[PDB]
């Protein structure tokens, strides 16, 4: 009759009641995503509304039990998970206003027109064009016709969210986002929200030289495509980076290639000349996963999953996803073709599924990853390992007389660096700006000035046209218009290389790290499943320390991964200048 | 001569919290037509051996049938604990009998979800061996009584199995039969082939 038996009974009832509703909602969502008709939306909305109403009603009743009166740990985490409440502590009118603002902002971003709609038209122009004016007009038009119309809504959004955050004993909405990394445990395994900023800042000072060299080879290679628009000592203009914003630099490979005659490893032809279909692809993925000590897929996986387009006049979206419906039901939905990229996404999604099956024994509230960055980093390393020449040579898609040339290795490393290293400053700058805006450090009349000064100082990118305070540049991104946290990718990028170096060390591999394969190593896959079974039942410091042996982030493995590229990049910059001076702007004359 | 057929392929089985008992007497027991069916997932027998079941006879044999989950089958055994082994159906430590189970996904499952099978998850104390409970009185958790209406810390004691064909193996329906052998001062009458 103490304050623990009641909580245990309450948790029992909630655990056995939530499964039904969750399974029904997931089933309805899958059925809609497989057909897309007019009658399935009603069922999906009904299931979602019922589940949300049940969750809110039950979370309302769970705050009557204080936390300090319970001595066990798992029960304490379950109550902590069930006791969170956002936007439920506000007046009804304020909630209605906030919902209207969010819906209007999402809709106004969804159907923007610049003079061609964003998704089909402007993206292709940004990705493929090589004309200065052609990119310039699209960039300026989209920014002017989207950001200028989104300013007052975002001004109201920050105030409403600050009120909501302060109503929940928080200091700021940014402080509310950082709480996903907070821990409370014994002496050696705690973590506070303040240390996240310091941890992120320290990890960024150890990546700057590599970014500077990558910046100085791109600046120098684009001298030719654009003859007299970029200075040899200034910063790169924002409208020449391969995307609308510059989040990824991956579309600059044809312009910046070390050795442009030797091609990369592509095995589409040697795979079509053997009559391979999707079932073969997934069987090979399953063989790879069972060769490292992990189990095999269930029988319902092969019967209920969708692995190809239906050509019988039913419409589908089939963006590659992995589903965990519940009650032992696992499905994968993907429109598979016979290229190599699909062959790698198969491994990625199979890793996603393999993580879900491990923690099915945990209670309902603890069936998720340790934090928001683990679940993607787990799936990334499988794709990293499954694209090496050793694996392809063993499988059969590559002849055994193959020779590993170093120039191809340099090409591969440069492409990977353009994909990975080029996005860290963008994420760091965006998150720092959003935190400072939420915290009230930045005055409301100096948003764009601080934005572009920070861009110049950190990422080395300058605007082509000056902007006053009537614009709003951050809102043009998808994750800013619709409220989503953005610090996941930094942590995922660190974690994946942490895990990869640890497992490669366990596998007794010799040589450079980028040529590592963990196939046919039962110890490597046996150690990894120790953290996969934990789920959210123990702090993520345990999850990190079990595998790698450390309790904090470390960027050393990532730099160890790019060592040959660092050595080669340092030599071709002898007759060049490293760094950028933020006094050059391309409208001074 | 007697129906070990009307216990095994009956149209409708019973819930676990209300388990049905059938007694067989004055008959000849054929235990070879069961062990060679090749459609039974588990055929464990305690206290006897399946080969020697035809030799020594008894007075009465009791058969109990019910429906449980796939991963709760291992709780039907002596000295096992769990949700269903202390609130629904219990077996004594000194057991003499057999436990038989097989998959029933093709029958006890519907797309909309079957809801006619229940089990008990709240009770004040464990069950004595071979004891059955049917009452539906509202369970009391706190010290403040609630008068016949569910509210705060007052819970209904029964819950339903949501069987659907798309579930995994561990969440699919299974049909279980338990046989017990009775030997007392009454004359032994049930045994078979000579
Ligand atoms: C875990 O908690 C301990 C104690 O609450 C933290 O250690 C303190 O850290 C502050 C940092 O400003 C110091 O001023 C104190 O002197 C420390 N106290 C002790 C006893 O060491 C520790 O930092 C927490 N862990 C993390 C990761 O934040
Ligand atoms: C797939 O590539 C193989 C490898 O060369 C091709 O095989 C040759 O095909 C010609 C014409 O059929 C034969 O005369 C040669 O003897 C084959 N060489 C070898 C070593 O196999 C083949 O043509 C391609 N696709 C297929 C199977 O037709
Ligand atoms: C997981 O299931 C697959 C199902 O195919 C198993 O693969 C079979 O393994 C047996 C030997 O155990 C072989 O004789 C079959 O030829 C395999 N099938 C195929 C299609 O190759 C696999 O062994 C199972 N994994 C484990 C650990 O038992
Ligand atoms: C319960 O009914 C099934 C059929 O619904 C019986 O299966 C029969 O098994 C015998 C052998 O034992 C076969 O010769 C028959 O062909 C099967 N089918 C039928 C329709 O008889 C099953 O044996 C029955 N269970 C018992 C008798 O215990
Ligand atoms: C749903 O999709 C299946 C095949 O994926 C199709 O057979 C069925 O007709 C679709 N539903 C409706 C209502 O048409
Ligand atoms: Zn993924």
Residue numbers in the entry:
A (entry chain A): 19 to 133, 142 to 615
B (entry chain B): 335 to 528
Original authors' sentences:
In the PT S/rdACE2 complex, one RBD of PT S was observed to interact with the peptidase domain (PD) of rdACE2, while the other two RBDs were in a downward conformation. To obtain a high-resolution view of the RBD/ACE2 interface, local refinement was performed, resulting in the determination of the PT RBD/rdACE2 and Alpha S RBD/rdACE2 structures at 2.64 Å and 3.16 Å, respectively. In patch 1 of both PT and Alpha RBD, S477 and N487 form hydrogen bonds (H-bonds) with Q18 and Y83, respectively. In PT RBD, Q493 in patch 1 binds to Y34 of the rdACE2, whereas in Alpha RBD, Q493 forms an H-bond contact with E35. Moving to patch 2, T500 and N501 of both PT and Alpha RBD form H-bonds with Y41 of rdACE2, while G502 of these two RBDs forms an H-bond with R353 of rdACE2. Furthermore, in PT RBD, Y449 forms an H-bond contact with E38 and Q42 of rdACE2. Additionally, in PT RBD, G496 binds to E38 of rdACE2 via an H-bond. Through this structural analysis, we observed that the binding interface of PT RBD/hACE2 is larger than that of PT RBD/rdACE2. Specifically, residues Y473, G476, E484 and S494 of PT RBD were found to be involved in binding to hACE2 but not to rdACE2.
In our study, we investigated the binding affinities of raccoon dog ACE2 (rdACE2) to the spike (S) protein receptor binding domain (RBD) of SARS-CoV-2 prototype (PT) and its variants. To elucidate the molecular basis of rdACE2 binding to SARS-CoV-2 PT and Alpha RBDs, respectively, we obtained cryo-EM rdACE2/S complex structures. The cryo-EM structures of rdACE2 bound to SARS-CoV-2 PT or Alpha S proteins were determined at 2.52 Å and 2.86 Å, respectively.
